Amino acid sequence: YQLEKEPIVGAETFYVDGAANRETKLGKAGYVTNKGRQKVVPLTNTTNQKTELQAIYLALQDSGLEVNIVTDSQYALGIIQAQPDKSESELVNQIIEQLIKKEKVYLAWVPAHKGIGGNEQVDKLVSAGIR
Ligand SMILES: CC(C)c1ccc(O)c(=O)c(O)c1
Ligand SMILES: [Mn+2]
Ligand SMILES: [Mn+2]
């Protein structure tokens, strides 16, 4: 697979986010799209970074052949921008299989809690009752 250098104009944009509880290890991954599409999935035995990759996997599963994904996860961004062929993580390998499936993917990064509206909406959905 290959990543777009710039946004696909007109393609549904998924804002993704995760939240995990350290003590309990319970979490939520989800997304919110510019088209009013939303998804929250509860999670068990997980970490912050696993919920962030899980949010991305969901975005890819539910999207369309061209897609824009906007994450606040430096960790997942590195994984995906490094374009591995295979990883030890089953989750990463599934993400990679999705990315080979797409015609165009554009992934961008934005900082957490800085007012970027789609990011902020999904943060409140995933972090409800968790943080
Ligand atoms: C501000 C801290 C708690 C934080 C860090 C990293 C994230 O990815 C987040 O999504 C988040 O809501 C909060
Ligand atoms: Mn996050
Ligand atoms: Mn968040």
Side-chain angles (χ1 to χ4, degrees), residues 14-66:
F14 290 68
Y15 295 83
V16 290
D17 203 16
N21 191 273
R22 234 183 90 261
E23 287 282 31
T24 63
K25 294 278 276 6
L26 296 159
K28 277 171 175 166
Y31 62 65
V32 143
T33 82
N34 51 5
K35 292 161 67 74
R37 193 198 315 279
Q38 302 199 346
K39 179 185 194 57
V40 182
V41 173
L43 297 167
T44 258
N45 198 237
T46 196
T47 61
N48 257 193
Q49 288 88 349
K50 227 151 259 147
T51 64
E52 300 283 4
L53 265 344
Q54 185 53 238
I56 288 164
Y57 182 51
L58 261 24
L60 295 174
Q61 276 192 300
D62 292 7
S63 39
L65 292 173
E66 291 171 8

Side-chain angles (χ1 to χ4, degrees), residues 60-117:
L60 295 174
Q61 276 192 300
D62 292 7
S63 39
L65 292 173
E66 291 171 8
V67 61
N68 297 307
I69 295 160
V70 174
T71 7
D72 72 36
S73 186
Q74 285 284 302
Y75 188 100
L77 188 73
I79 290 163
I80 293 152
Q81 296 193 333
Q83 299 166 284
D85 284 336
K86 199 199 86 220
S87 158
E88 272 301 301
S89 163
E90 178 165 82
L91 213 201
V92 172
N93 291 330
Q94 290 178 313
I95 286 174
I96 288 159
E97 130 223 283
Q98 282 299 304
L99 295 168
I100 312 189
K101 204 80 38 69
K102 299 301 186 176
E103 276 163 17
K104 296 200 178 164
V105 48
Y106 172 75
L107 175 70
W109 176 81
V110 299
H113 309 282
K114 299 289 144 159
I116 290 115

